[PDB]
Design an enzyme around this catalytic site. Structure first.
Site, short mmCIF file in Angstrom:
data_model
loop_
_atom_site.label_atom_id
_atom_site.label_comp_id
_atom_site.label_asym_id
_atom_site.label_seq_id
_atom_site.Cartn_x
_atom_site.Cartn_y
_atom_site.Cartn_z
N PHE D 123 1.06 -0.82 0.37
CA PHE D 123 0.09 -0.02 0.02
C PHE D 123 0.72 1.38 0.10
CE2 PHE D 123 -5.03 1.71 0.00
CZ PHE D 123 -5.24 0.54 -0.08
N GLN D 244 -7.45 14.78 2.77
CA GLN D 244 -7.09 13.94 1.50
C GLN D 244 -7.79 13.45 0.36
OE1 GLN D 244 -6.70 9.40 2.51
NE2 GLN D 244 -4.79 10.92 3.08
N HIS D 246 -7.66 11.69 -2.43
CA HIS D 246 -7.56 10.48 -2.18
C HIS D 246 -6.86 10.01 -4.42
CE1 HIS D 246 -7.73 5.90 -3.77
NE2 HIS D 246 -7.59 5.54 -2.45
N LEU D 256 -14.92 5.55 -4.94
CA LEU D 256 -13.98 5.48 -4.89
C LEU D 256 -12.93 4.26 -5.50
CD1 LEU D 256 -11.01 5.99 -2.75
CD2 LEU D 256 -11.10 3.32 -2.13
N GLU D 259 -6.88 2.16 -3.76
CA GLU D 259 -5.16 1.87 -3.63
C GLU D 259 -4.14 0.50 -4.10
OE1 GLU D 259 -1.76 4.10 -1.14
OE2 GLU D 259 -3.39 5.27 -2.03
N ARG D 290 -0.69 9.63 -0.62
CA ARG D 290 -1.51 9.92 -1.86
C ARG D 290 -1.50 11.33 -1.98
NH1 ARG D 290 -6.69 6.65 2.25
NH2 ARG D 290 -6.22 4.72 0.17
N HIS D 357 -11.52 12.31 -0.47
CA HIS D 357 -12.31 11.00 0.49
C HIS D 357 -11.92 10.97 2.03
CE1 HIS D 357 -11.25 6.37 0.36
NE2 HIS D 357 -10.12 6.84 0.70
N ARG D 401 -3.13 10.89 5.70
CA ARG D 401 -3.02 9.33 6.14
C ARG D 401 -2.16 8.98 4.91
NH1 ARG D 401 -6.79 5.44 5.85
NH2 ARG D 401 -8.20 7.11 4.33
C1 FAD Z 1 -15.18 7.25 1.81
C2 FAD Z 1 -14.54 6.25 1.73
C3 FAD Z 1 -13.41 5.83 2.89
C4 FAD Z 1 -12.34 4.79 2.97
C5 FAD Z 1 -12.12 3.94 2.24
C6 FAD Z 1 -12.97 3.53 1.00
C7 FAD Z 1 -13.94 4.74 0.65
C8 FAD Z 1 -14.89 4.64 -0.54
N1 FAD Z 1 -11.16 2.55 1.95
C9 FAD Z 1 -11.09 2.38 3.13
C10 FAD Z 1 -9.67 1.70 3.56
O1 FAD Z 1 -9.27 0.67 2.94
N2 FAD Z 1 -8.57 1.49 4.25
C11 FAD Z 1 -8.78 2.69 5.25
O2 FAD Z 1 -7.73 2.67 6.67
N3 FAD Z 1 -9.83 3.80 5.26
C12 FAD Z 1 -10.60 3.67 3.68
N4 FAD Z 1 -11.26 4.59 4.35
C13 FAD Z 1 -11.30 5.91 5.23
C14 FAD Z 1 -12.40 5.19 6.42
O3 FAD Z 1 -13.39 4.54 5.86
C15 FAD Z 1 -13.27 5.81 7.24
O4 FAD Z 1 -12.22 6.71 7.46
C16 FAD Z 1 -14.27 4.92 8.76
O5 FAD Z 1 -14.29 4.11 8.07
C17 FAD Z 1 -14.77 6.01 9.46
O6 FAD Z 1 -15.42 5.67 9.76
P1 FAD Z 1 -16.10 5.79 11.43
O7 FAD Z 1 -16.39 4.76 12.48
O8 FAD Z 1 -15.58 6.82 11.87
O9 FAD Z 1 -17.22 6.26 10.20
P2 FAD Z 1 -18.43 5.89 9.28
O10 FAD Z 1 -18.26 5.18 8.93
O11 FAD Z 1 -18.16 7.17 8.86
O12 FAD Z 1 -19.79 6.53 9.84
C18 FAD Z 1 -20.29 7.57 10.74
C19 FAD Z 1 -20.99 7.08 11.96
O13 FAD Z 1 -21.74 7.81 12.76
C20 FAD Z 1 -23.40 8.05 12.59
N5 FAD Z 1 -23.73 9.39 12.72
C21 FAD Z 1 -23.01 10.68 12.19
N6 FAD Z 1 -24.11 11.57 11.77
C22 FAD Z 1 -24.75 11.43 13.04
C23 FAD Z 1 -25.86 11.92 13.95
N7 FAD Z 1 -25.91 12.78 13.81
N8 FAD Z 1 -26.53 10.90 14.88
C24 FAD Z 1 -26.70 9.87 15.36
N9 FAD Z 1 -25.80 9.21 14.46
C25 FAD Z 1 -24.80 10.17 13.29
C26 FAD Z 1 -23.55 7.73 11.64
O14 FAD Z 1 -24.93 6.42 11.73
C27 FAD Z 1 -22.65 6.43 10.73
O15 FAD Z 1 -23.12 4.79 12.10
O1 TEO Z 2 -7.36 3.22 -1.31
C1 TEO Z 2 -7.99 2.51 -0.44
O2 TEO Z 2 -8.44 1.07 -0.53
C2 TEO Z 2 -8.29 3.81 0.60
O3 TEO Z 2 -9.29 4.53 0.32
C3 TEO Z 2 -7.58 3.04 2.07
C4 TEO Z 2 -7.67 4.18 3.01
O4 TEO Z 2 -6.85 3.58 4.45
O5 TEO Z 2 -8.50 5.27 2.65
#
Ligand code: FAD
Ligand code: TEO
Ligand code: HEM
Ligand code: JZR
Ligand code: SF4
Ligand code: F3S
Ligand code: FES
Lengths: 102, 139, 242, 614
Positions: D123, D244, D246, D256, D259, D290, D357, D401
């Site tokens: 990665f 960030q 991506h 997305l 990577e 990135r 991203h 990141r």
């Molecule tokens: C967009 C993205 C990000 C991503 C990725 C691929 C995509 C398409 N692939 C990744 C990977 O392979 N490896 C990695 O380390 N990171 C990767 N990312 C980034 C990462 O996914 C995100 O940073 C991460 O999943 C963050 O998750 P987190 O647990 O912090 O939360 P979330 O999943 O985004 O969920 C938000 C939760 O909060 C609740 N919420 C939001 N607003 C409210 C309110 N107002 N009230 C109550 N709850 C709220 C939502 O319901 C949700 O559950």
């Molecule tokens: O390219 C990915 O799979 C990716 O989006 C991962 C992170 O960590 O953000």
């Protein structure tokens, strides 16, 4: 039987197969034996069959009890009448041959 | 936490007393051949059973025996077309249900599940049904 | 720009806060030249430009979250990966997933669907879990492959709400989605409760209301085969011992 | 005021807001520890953005070659461009192997090696021997749907505890009293009711805010709601300007494209067929950080080597890889490329462009997940309030990141908040009272948006904010453009006074919920672009073409011997702390030092800033 439902599912298919095998048997070796085998398999397969239908479509403890009770009577009488037709009349295999002569 | 059963009981409890409507299903759903053949398999099974029941009831209740009714019908020396028609009508449901029944036993062995195979077996069932039914209504 | 291609969408409506409101169908016109290629793009344009009272679930926009499942043109699917149909002579009808209680407009109450999934205990169980966390469990490439086609499920519910047995007995028939996940745990080589998972389906409904209709598999947005998974469960039911 | 809204009160030991990877792990961790816990989420848990994650989660398991978690520590610190706190980074990386083994034991279906162990891929920005030994392969994965499996596995796991879930409840604000969090107030979306959850401790795990932008990989639901709650509470957010991009969102839809594609051998190609990264980063090439690849790609496009009919994107090429590999390592994107770009990845390149991203910045916390405030030069924990996941700035990611480090952060800090609460409190301690009308202003605002009848409709104000951040706070930035953006945003913010909403119901009124989400995104966006305008230096993802250098307390490009260290006020190696006056929407900035000490210098050396290149 902790395995009741799956033992039923298996018997159902065993019987369906049984009956499939009786079609060729009726054509090639008509007579009493097949005549009764068909009476028993047609009833058993149709009874289980109509029961899956009641089960899917009938709801409510009582309507279910009623449908199943009526089914058990339909079936008992149906197997009876077929054994009767076989004992007192020409019998399933011969009747099909005759009807196919019209 | 609420256990799964409790979650299920409150769902019914909340909704049946709600004013929420039930979204349409059977009146808006798109058909497919497999779907149509499915319900036709159930419809032919029920019809075949009801027929076997009616025939056994006639055996217990009518004043004459089979040979007399055969003869009666024959004494009408009906047109061959009509005769054929009737034999075809009789054997078709049996035929359809046997062949599709064989297809169901094959599925019960876990074979033929790709959707494109489901479409193929259904069509092989239809043509064998039609063929075996013309075959037999001719004997 | 200048040269439109107007499409009509007839969409299911029902407001629970309008006393005595009855389900109705509302029609909207959208210029396909000024909208994304997907039905969700259209539902979002309608909401943003014509009627912000139109209500529906949605989140990821790429067909991985499962939120936007609904019935489109007669079939259950994800609005976000469903191509808008270009033939302008046809109105596309949109309804909520079938035979479900409507909370509002295109939003069904999925809570019984989720309680059925909780009931099969969808998580790894080992007889001796006294070593949870110390080391990776070993699983061969070959046993891992058994999971392909089972684990991708996104619990959108298109399959079970397409299944006529589920329409008639959804209170007791677990439906295709949850059954395929129970199969996913039954064959995970790392799980030690296969017999207990099978034992749980010994009743006339959980599993046995499936008569192989195959609407489930035809409808799945992920290309999965819940109908097959079920047939494999039925075989295991029929052969397991103890 | 009048309760036109019925209010339900709950009392719990703890409340977790959010049910993605971080929140689910924190919420059952708390229940596993004996705490009566509530989890409040605006989505059914598995719909959370975490479900869309693809390439993997890092941990030095050493299943492909010998590894060392300290090598991971180093990679992360260098990757953060020294804006990362090394105590948090220490904790994150040393805890990684156990965090991942935990997921595998929960049943997460990781791909496997010939030894039956978790398969890990290369990665970006990861190496062996502290930077000197070549490409690491420590990103553990479930083909290219790691996020999906990670979330479904955690969700199935939460089903074993007695955590109380309030699904599809939209959190509005924190219940603050005397600098302490006493809980949160929310809208139950299904029946229109208002709920106040009182608890001795509150965990915020609400996700990032990629949707402040016009094109983002983020889901429609990534709207910074928790971040805005903190802001509304008068607490500081941190490093919000570090956004960030991506390298590879798919052209058009923005989806997305992992990577992992480049980790498995894919390459970026410009309109002339050049693998331009061999030029911009001769060693790392397409596996550089990135912030770098994204800047390079962006350079290639404005310099004319763009691809497609508008010369506005580049190519991600995978067709030279064997097809079995693509089917095994990259099935999700294979399908996605085709559905959203009509591309058959075994034949044609995927059209891609850098896309907003992930949010590096967020609610500041110590390495234990406790939110901190900063007064007169010192960090002070906010009693009762924790944050973890993308909504937090611990900060393990500083200015940029590394891919596969966010899913790790989720589970490591979500578990960390539960551990910290457990060593600090006891289940059942009396839950703090709240004045009878705590929260009434949240209801007031909600009521006001419901009946809003102005001239600018919610979708309009939102598109305004998105296009503004998109052209004024992009990959490359400058003062003039940033200043223009600031003033356009401040205007759009004043303009919220003219909002028009149409739905007047209260049950599933997404017209209104998405208007609350607009308030939330606006607070995040204002802090971001004003933090950017103020930061005259270039670090990680924050590139100022008018302040092209990274400015630290020393010039780490020459011996430190006989160098006058620069004053805190005269350099930029410090976290930005943004505050917003919600009425006016005016932004205030302060700074706090980056933490360089690790959790144990004998075990893991602190790594001093150095020149950063790939
Ligand atoms: C967009 C993205 C990000 C991503 C990725 C691929 C995509 C398409 N692939 C990744 C990977 O392979 N490896 C990695 O380390 N990171 C990767 N990312 C980034 C990462 O996914 C995100 O940073 C991460 O999943 C963050 O998750 P987190 O647990 O912090 O939360 P979330 O999943 O985004 O969920 C938000 C939760 O909060 C609740 N919420 C939001 N607003 C409210 C309110 N107002 N009230 C109550 N709850 C709220 C939502 O319901 C949700 O559950
Ligand atoms: O390219 C990915 O799979 C990716 O989006 C991962 C992170 O960590 O953000
Ligand atoms: C004369 C026959 C009669 C009177 C008969 C009647 C029945 C009935 C009433 C049904 C229930 C329908 C349903 O469950 O939907 C049934 C189902 C079926 N029968 Fe027959 N049938 C006959 C012959 C056959 C033959 C020769 C085969 C082979 C066959 C195979 C099947 C099978 C496989 C089913 C189970 C269908 C499912 O799983 O949904 N039957 N039949
Ligand atoms: C309207 C009720 C009867 C329709 C019977 C056949 O229906 C057709 O089956 C095909 C093959 O599965 C489908 O691809 C097609 O869309 C469908 O309309
Ligand atoms: S099996 Fe397919 S259709 Fe069914 S819930 Fe899962 S992904 Fe949705
Ligand atoms: S549509 Fe239903 S009957 Fe069985 S094969 Fe699919 S679950
Ligand atoms: S919005 Fe996520 S599946 Fe469609």
């Amino acid at each position: 039987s902790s395995k009741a439902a799956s033992l039923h599912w298996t018997s159902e298919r065993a019987v369906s197969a049984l009956l499939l095998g009786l079609l060729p048997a009726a054509y090639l070796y008509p007579g009493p034996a097949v005549d009764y085998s068909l009476a028993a398999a047609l009833t058993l397969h149709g009874h289980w069959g109509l029961g899956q239908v009641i089960t899917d479509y009938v709801h409510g403890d009582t309507p279910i009890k009623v449908a199943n009770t009526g089914l058990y009577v339909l079936s008992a009488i149906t197997f009876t009448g077929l054994c009767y037709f076989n004992y007192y009349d020409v019998g399933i295999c011969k009747a099909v041959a005759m009807l196919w002569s019209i | 936490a609420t256990t799964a059963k409790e979650e299920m009981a409150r769902f019914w409890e909340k909704n049946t007393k709600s004013s929420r409507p039930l979204s349409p299903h059977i009146s808006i759903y798109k058909w497919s051949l497999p779907m149509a053949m499915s319900i036709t398999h159930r419809g032919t099974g029920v019809a075949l059973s009801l027929g076997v029941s009616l025939f056994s009831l006639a055996a217990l209740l009518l004043p004459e025996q089979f040979p007399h009714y055969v003869a009666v019908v024959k004494s009408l020396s009906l047109s061959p077309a009509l005769i054929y028609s009737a034999k075809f009508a009789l054997v078709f449901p049996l035929s359809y249900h046997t062949w599709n029944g064989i297809r169901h036993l094959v599925w019960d062995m876990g074979k033929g599940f790709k959707l494109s195979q489901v479409e193929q077996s259904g069509v092989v069932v239809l043509i064998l049904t039609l063929l075996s039914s013309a075959g037999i209504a001719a004997i | 720009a200048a040269t439109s291609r107007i499409k009509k969408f007839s969409i299911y409506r029902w407001d629970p806060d309008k006393p005595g409101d009855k389900p109705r169908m509302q029609t909207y016109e959208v210029d396909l030249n000024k909208c994304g290629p997907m039905v969700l793009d259209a539902l979002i344009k309608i909401k943003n430009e014509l009627d912000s009272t139109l209500t529906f679930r949605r989140s990821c926009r790429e067909g991985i979250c499962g939120s936007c499942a609904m019935n489109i043109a007669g079939g259950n699917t994800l609005a976000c990966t469903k191509k808008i149909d270009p033939d302008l002579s046809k109105t596309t009808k949109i309804y909520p997933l079938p035979h479900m209680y409507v909370v509002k407009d295109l939003v069904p109450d999925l809570s019984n669907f989720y309680a059925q999934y909780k009931s099969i205990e969808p998580y790894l169980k080992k007889k001796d879990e006294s070593k949870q966390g110390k080391e990776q469990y070993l699983q061969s490439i070959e046993d891992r492959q058994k999971l392909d086609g089972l684990y991708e499920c996104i619990l959108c519910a298109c399959c079970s709400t397409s299944c006529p047995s589920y329409w008639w007995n959804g209170d007791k028939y677990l439906g295709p989605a949850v059954l395929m996940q129970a199969y996913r745990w039954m064959i995970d080589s790392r799980d030690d409760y296969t017999e207990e998972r099978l034992a749980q389906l010994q009743d006339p409904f959980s599993l046995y209301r499936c008569h192989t209709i195959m609407n489930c598999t035809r409808t799945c947005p992920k290309g999965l085969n819940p109908g097959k998974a079920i047939a494999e469960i039925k075989k295991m039911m029929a052969t397991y011992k103890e | 005021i009048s309760t036109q809204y019925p209010v339900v009160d709950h009392e719990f030991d703890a409340v977790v807001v959010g049910a993605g990877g971080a929140g689910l792990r924190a919420a059952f961790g708390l229940s596993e520890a004996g705490f009566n816990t509530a989890c409040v989420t605006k989505l059914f848990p598995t719909r959370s953005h975490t479900v869309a994650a693809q390439g993997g989660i890092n941990a030095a398991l050493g299943n492909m070659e010998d590894d060392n978690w300290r090598w991971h520590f180093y990679d992360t610190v260098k990757g953060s461009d020294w804006l990362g706190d090394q105590d948090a980074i220490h904790y994150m990386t040393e805890q990684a192997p156990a965090a991942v083994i935990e997921l595998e034991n929960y049943g997460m279906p990781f791909s496997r090696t010939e030894e039956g162990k978790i398969y890990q891929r290369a990665f970006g920005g990861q190496s062996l021997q502290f930077g000197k030994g070549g490409q690491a392969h420590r990103c553990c994965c479930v083909a290219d749907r790691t996020g999906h499996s990670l979330l479904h596995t955690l969700y199935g796991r939460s089903l074993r505890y007695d955590t109380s879930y309030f699904v599809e409840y939209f959190a509005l604000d924190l219940l603050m009293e005397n600098g302490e969090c006493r809980g949160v107030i929310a809208l139950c979306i299904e029946d229109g009711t208002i709920h106040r959850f009182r608890a001795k401790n509150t965990v915020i795990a609400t996700g990032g805010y990629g949707r402040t932008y016009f094109s983002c990989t983020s889901a429609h639901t990534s709207t910074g709601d928790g971040t805005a709650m903190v802001t509304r509470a008068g607490l500081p957010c941190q490093d919000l300007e570090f956004v960030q991009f991506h390298p590879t969102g798919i052209y058009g839809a923005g989806c997305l494209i992992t990577e992992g594609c480049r980790g498995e051998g894919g390459i970026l190609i410009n309109s002339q067929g050049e693998r331009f990264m061999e030029r911009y980063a001769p060693v790392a090439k397409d596996l550089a950080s990135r912030d770098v690849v994204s800047r390079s790609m962006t350079i290639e496009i404005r310099e004319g080597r763009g691809c497609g009919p508008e010369k506005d994107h580049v190519y991600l090429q995978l067709h030279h890889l064997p097809p079995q590999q693509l089917a095994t390592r990259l099935p999700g994107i294979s399908e996605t490329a085709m559905i959203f770009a009509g591309v058959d990845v075994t034949k044609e390149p995927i059209p891609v462009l850098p896309t907003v991203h992930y949010n590096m910045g967020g609610i500041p916390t110590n390495y234990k997940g406790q939110v901190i405030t900063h007064v007169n030069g010192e960090d002070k924990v906010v009693p009762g309030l924790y944050a973890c996941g993308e909504a937090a700035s611990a900060s393990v990611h500083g200015a940029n990141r590394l891919g596969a480090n966010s899913l790790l952060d989720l589970v490591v800090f979500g578990r960390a908040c539960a551990l910290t609460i457990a060593e600090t409190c006891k289940p059942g301690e009396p839950v703090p009272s709240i004045k009878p009308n705590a929260g009434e202003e949240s209801v007031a605002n909600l009521d006001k948006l419901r009946f809003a009848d102005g001239t600018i409709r919610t979708s309009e104000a939102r598109l305004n904010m998105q296009k503004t951040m998109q052209s004024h706070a992009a990959v490359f930035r400058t003062g003039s453009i940033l200043q223009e953006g600031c003033e356009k945003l401040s205007q759009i913010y004043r303009d919220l006074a003219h909002l028009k909403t149409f739905d007047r119901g209260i049950v599933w009124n997404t017209d209104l919920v998405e208007t609350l989400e607009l308030q939330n995104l606006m607070l995040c966006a204002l802090q971001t672009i004003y933090g950017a305008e103020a930061r005259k230096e270039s670090r990680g993802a924050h590139a100022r073409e008018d302040y092209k250098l990274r400015i630290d307390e020393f010039d780490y490009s020459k011996p430190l011997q006989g160098q006058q260290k620069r004053p805190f006020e005269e350099h930029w190696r410090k976290h930005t702390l943004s505050y917003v006056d919600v009425k006016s929407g005016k932004v205030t900035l302060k700074y706090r030092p980056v933490i360089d000490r690790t959790l144990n210098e004998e075990d893991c050396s602190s790594v001093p800033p150095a020149i950063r290149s790939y």
